[PDB]
Paper text:
Purine nucleoside phosphorylase (PNP, purine nucleoside orthophosphate ribosyl transferase, EC 2.4.2.1) has a crucial role in the purine salvage pathway. E. coli PNP is an excellent molecular machine conducting efficient catalysis of purine nucleosides glycosidic bond cleavage. It is a homohexamer, built as a trimer of dimers, with all its subunits having the active site in the open conformation in the apo enzyme form.
Here all the sites clearly show the presence of the nucleoside and the refined occupancies of FA molecules are 0.7, 0.5, and 0.6 for chains A, B, and D, respectively. It turned out that the conformation of both proteins with all the active sites occupied by both ligands was the same, with a closed conformation in one of three active sites. Both ligands are in the same orientation in the active sites of WT and DM, and the conformation of crucial amino acids is very similar. As already mentioned, amino acids Asp204 and Arg217 are responsible for the protonation of the nucleoside substrate.
Residue numbers in the entry:
A (entry chain A), B (entry chain D), C (entry chain B), D (entry chain A), E (entry chain B), F (entry chain D): 1 to 237
Write the structure that this text describes.
Amino acid sequence: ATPHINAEMGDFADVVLMPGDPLRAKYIAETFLEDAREVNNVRGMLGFTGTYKGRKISVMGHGMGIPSCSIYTKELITDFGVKKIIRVGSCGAVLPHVKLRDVVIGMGACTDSKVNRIRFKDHDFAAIADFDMVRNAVDAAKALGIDARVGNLFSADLFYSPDGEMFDVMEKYGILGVEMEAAGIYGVAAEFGAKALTICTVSAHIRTHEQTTAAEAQTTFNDMIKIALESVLLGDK
Amino acid sequence: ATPHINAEMGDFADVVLMPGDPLRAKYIAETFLEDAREVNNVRGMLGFTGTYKGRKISVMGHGMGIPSCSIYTKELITDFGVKKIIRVGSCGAVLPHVKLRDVVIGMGACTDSKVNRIRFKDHDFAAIADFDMVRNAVDAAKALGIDARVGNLFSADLFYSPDGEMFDVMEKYGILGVEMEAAGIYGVAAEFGAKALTICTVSAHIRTHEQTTAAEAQTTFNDMIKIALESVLLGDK
Amino acid sequence: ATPHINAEMGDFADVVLMPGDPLRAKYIAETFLEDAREVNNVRGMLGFTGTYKGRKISVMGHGMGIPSCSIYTKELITDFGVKKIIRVGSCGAVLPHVKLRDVVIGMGACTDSKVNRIRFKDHDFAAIADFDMVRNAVDAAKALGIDARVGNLFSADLFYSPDGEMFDVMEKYGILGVEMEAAGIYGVAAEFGAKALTICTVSAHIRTHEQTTAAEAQTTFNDMIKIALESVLLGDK
Amino acid sequence: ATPHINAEMGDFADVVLMPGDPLRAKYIAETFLEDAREVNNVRGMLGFTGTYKGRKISVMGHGMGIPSCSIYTKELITDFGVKKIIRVGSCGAVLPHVKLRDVVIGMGACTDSKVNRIRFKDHDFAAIADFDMVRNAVDAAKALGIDARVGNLFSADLFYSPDGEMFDVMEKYGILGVEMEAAGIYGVAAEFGAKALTICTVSAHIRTHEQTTAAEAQTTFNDMIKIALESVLLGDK
Amino acid sequence: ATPHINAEMGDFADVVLMPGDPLRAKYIAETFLEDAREVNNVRGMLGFTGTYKGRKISVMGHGMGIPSCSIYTKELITDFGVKKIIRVGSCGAVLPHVKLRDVVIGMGACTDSKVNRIRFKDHDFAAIADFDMVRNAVDAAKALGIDARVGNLFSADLFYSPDGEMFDVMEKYGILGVEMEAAGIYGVAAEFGAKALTICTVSAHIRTHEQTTAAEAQTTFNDMIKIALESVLLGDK
Amino acid sequence: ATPHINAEMGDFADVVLMPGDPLRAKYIAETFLEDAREVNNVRGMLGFTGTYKGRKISVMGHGMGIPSCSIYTKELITDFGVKKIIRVGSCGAVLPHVKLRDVVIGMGACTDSKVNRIRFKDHDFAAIADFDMVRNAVDAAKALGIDARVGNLFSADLFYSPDGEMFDVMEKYGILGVEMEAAGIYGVAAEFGAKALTICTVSAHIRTHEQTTAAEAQTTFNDMIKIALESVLLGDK
Ligand SMILES: Nc1ncnc2c([C@@H]3O[C@H](CO)[C@@H](O)[C@H]3O)n[nH]c12
Ligand SMILES: Nc1ncnc2c([C@@H]3O[C@H](CO)[C@@H](O)[C@H]3O)n[nH]c12
Ligand SMILES: Nc1ncnc2c([C@@H]3O[C@H](CO)[C@@H](O)[C@H]3O)n[nH]c12
Ligand SMILES: Nc1ncnc2c([C@@H]3O[C@H](CO)[C@@H](O)[C@H]3O)n[nH]c12
Ligand SMILES: Nc1ncnc2c([C@@H]3O[C@H](CO)[C@@H](O)[C@H]3O)n[nH]c12
Ligand SMILES: Nc1ncnc2c([C@@H]3O[C@H](CO)[C@@H](O)[C@H]3O)n[nH]c12
């Protein structure tokens, strides 16, 4: 057991899908995994392990924000033998050509957090996903006939940002989705020696104020899950 | 009625106690409140409203880290009429004279987060509690025969810090407890014109690695909750 | 003796009142202290030691700005056994409801100085007063029929700031008064393990230069000094 | 003509290979392009246009450092219709498993430059290559039977860095090569709306002090050129 | 009148000598100026105006630290028509070949203050003296048989710096003297379109507290004042 | 004998003039030196050594930007015994009274580069020229009947800045010319214990868009070179 996960080595697969919402983790386990078993509920942060097409897979929530997901991803990597983390999240769009439910793949993640500056002597660490995992997700999406854009996410510390003008800057620099975790997970993967990828579903448009409901995010973002799971199978080859 | 809280105005009291762990919110409601009812379960972040000695009180988890708790506190203040937030948590000590089970009140909170610099034009915002709430808590503790230390907390972005050296710095500058939320909550309170206070119990000593019993640790945790609840009654005057 | 104070251990009380204007020290000594003796004259920064209602008190100016007051407060603490510093001075207000002649107590002090970032590994140190000293001053003021406001000061490096927009930011975040010392004194207090408090009287509104008649200014100055001195007696407990 | 390029729209292909060394650009044109014509020599920064397997291609030096290459890439994008920039550079390795002449592909680029902070409101911009271009280079290398690692480069402002310890940090974070341009080119591509990729040949090992000669870098780094050119043909499909 | 100087336009010469120690102003006026009249006494910061060899000169102390001297120099320039400020003071040396009683002239001033970053959009402003004033002082010293060193001062915010390692960095980069004002005065001069120079006499080695006899210190002080005054006459040209 | 300079000790004079453009180095050697011979051609960065009025002098391009010129100047100083670097370049003016063809001497150089912060523990290093070289250049200009302005340059990382507002800031703080190298060269000189000076001719006015003739512009450029060469002869004394 670790301070935030009451489980033992072997309870998790070597690949873990991670939504921010533990209820989404529950939905994923019930809907996509066979013979799923709950392996953690410390702090209500539900985690499960089962199989997808014979392949051992885990899914567990990581909570909201870089500091929360940094705890869970670290513990999984250092104490549970986890080799790959695939965040399956939601995000808000700033670009005009992006619609609700669009799937975006974060090859990189910008951020206004200080965590990577703390790691990297106050320089610019380019928080990037593992290339093979990106390519696996792209290929899986194509086989599924699901459109997906690959590019930069922005990982915000403040969902309610006092700096509205920063969204103009994100838009200028082609940011595909604003979420709150990717850059931190990528920093953890590099620090602790594992691999990670974030895929998000657009659940809000920051300009139009169109948005999906909480229930929709919890139980209807199926495209990104299929992409994530099928991408794992590709990586195994 | 917000993306993270499925409740309506009136469902929350004008004061909310907030532990990090939603399971601990349920614990507090069951233990200390009469007629508590669940008012939120989005993302598993349980919230409850009941009464303490006839006074309407809410309790709801805030999740781990500044970004998580910043979402919930903002929404409570702007959308649910909440006037006071009291974070009730655990912290780690760095000072030799601060002991396991000491109760510490964060009149201020240092941080390595960038959120207040973003708010405050890259200058130093002193993230502080509301003075009247601090002295209500000090007085409630005194009435319960519990001494509480008042001073600075440090709100960390990284529970697993790569910078081992920062703990010596915290010790040098007299930090009473290390946690992950206070400076963010204080920043939200200032930004949105509300009042906040963080009280913590020392659950670990980053130095001594001291030991207590579960019974004693749980007693002190309950004492902290009683301090928080009684402090509200004093403020109501 | 120290580089800026020609005195020996014992020449200063364990509590020192510090105005910015060095001319105020002799005034305070003659008007409020009994049996005062001169204990410093280096650079014209006159210091005196006497008693107030039997209690040993010293008074000496600190000069304008963080670097000046940081020198005197450090030397007093490390070489003269001083345990408490009370800065007594003026501030300018940015809040429309904060009035000329209001007494404000800096529980915290924001700043645009780099001194605390230098101390605190470039993170956010919450520069705070000693809580008991704050409460003592609040209680002393109340007994004199004065309602003091407690909250954040802003300690500016530039009295003539080229950033006009910062005053609006200060206002938004509830800053009670703008002065030039508190954050520095609070930083020294934390660095060297002592206790400090800044009390200010509002002498100006930053944006509209209405002023106070000299007679009203002297009356309010005397009130502030009485609050400071009586607060010490309450602290002796 | 632009301030640093004496040519007109149409003189450059829509894809430009860019080594730092204009003499390497000359070598590339002579060795790999047919019917090459010199289209610029302002400041000795030689640029050429010819064909590779029937495909119009340009090659031009960009000079050393982010500020130098930022000028040339900008002008090409805004005034010469250039759509893709492929930097074909040299770099120094910090990882033990990396050898002289190894080819590395920079999907991302870390940096100690301030240029991206200036663009991105002092936040962390993840300076990333275009994904399709990365994938094209990976596929071309595989078809050529040439090994290539994909990951982060570090773009240094100081070839002679006074901070030797930063190399330990780069090594910890898996940096594949230290060069001086990638992060700046990626910033320009995003700012001015084009696509870019940096491929480098390891020409020095920062730990072992093994290094190739100036002449070798000028006229013998053929693997990376073949990869770059063949990757273009893949992208055209 | 201005907030810190009770005088009117014309009361000050267009050139003002400023010692840090306010007691030095009266000394300079009595010892070096003819027909001196008192022109300020606010906060005990005595100012005088007289003539030196027929030329109008004023002298007034500036207090310790950037924030203090920034107030006086700003008011003198904007409200009293002052064109040149010469700070005359002491510094501590870090270079082994810089000796006690050496005269040093700050052509530039490094700093750990944030004031110039606040002015200069967080970039590096090179805080510099007026070149002609520097050369005038060099020439005036030469005519008095004194060889002055010209180079960088370092203007510290903290006389008692917790960063001991910074003195070695200062030494490495050739800093001639450590004081507390020059960078601030130079910043004000640039902001308000005037000219400034800091001249210092070495009174200490930072690392080994050997000192100068009071008689030697007064002799060297007089030499510095004579250099300053004669430099003005050379500047009149 | 270095990766960027194929020459041996003795091939360079102890003073090197450096324009940005290697073709301009060749121009200077042909125009002003006797018996000039090429001593470097690596990366096309032409360098030459010849005599001026019997005095051995070298001239070599430094490329555009701080990172490029930092490589060449460091190597000249540490590997080729060079004692003095004189950058001879062009700059853009922001001040209305600074005119096309004015000669400006950079006694200091501001910058938006991070290189000096990296050197100087993240504080403000005032990047300055060698005082004696500045006054040699001023005197040489006077002897040629050319008035030269001495003050601050601004060394930009981005020739194409996204921050249009910085030019107003440069103007406000009195910057004489905008170029791309001086602060980097001055930082190198300080780091490695050598001496440097940047002289520029105003070739563009970022405001007026003034016009001159090519003949007149080229005359002034040659005057600047003569100032540089004659300044060396004065320093030799
Ligand atoms: N418009 C938006 N802005 C920032 N974060 C999110 C998210 C994700 O959902 C959570 C906040 O709702 C958090 O985990 C974040 O990554 N969905 N939509 C978002
Ligand atoms: N030694 C420590 N360091 C950082 N956070 C905590 C905590 C709290 O518990 C959570 C991390 O376990 C987080 O919400 C924080 O507030 N207890 N002890 C801590
Ligand atoms: N409106 C204002 N802005 C900045 N400082 C002050 C002060 C205090 O007075 C001094 C400036 O005159 C300085 O010591 C500061 O603490 N009073 N009113 C002020
Ligand atoms: N060990 C090293 N460190 C930094 N840059 C380089 C380079 C590249 O070559 C140039 C410096 O030699 C510059 O353009 C840079 O990108 N090769 N080897 C390098
Ligand atoms: N070794 C030293 N370190 C910092 N400042 C000074 C000074 C000057 O004297 C004052 C500090 O005593 C301050 O005004 C500064 O300019 N002399 N010697 C100094
Ligand atoms: N208005 C301007 N802005 C930036 N650099 C320059 C220059 C110089 O010329 C080069 C850029 O063209 C570079 O080396 C710089 O030093 N001339 N005019 C300039």
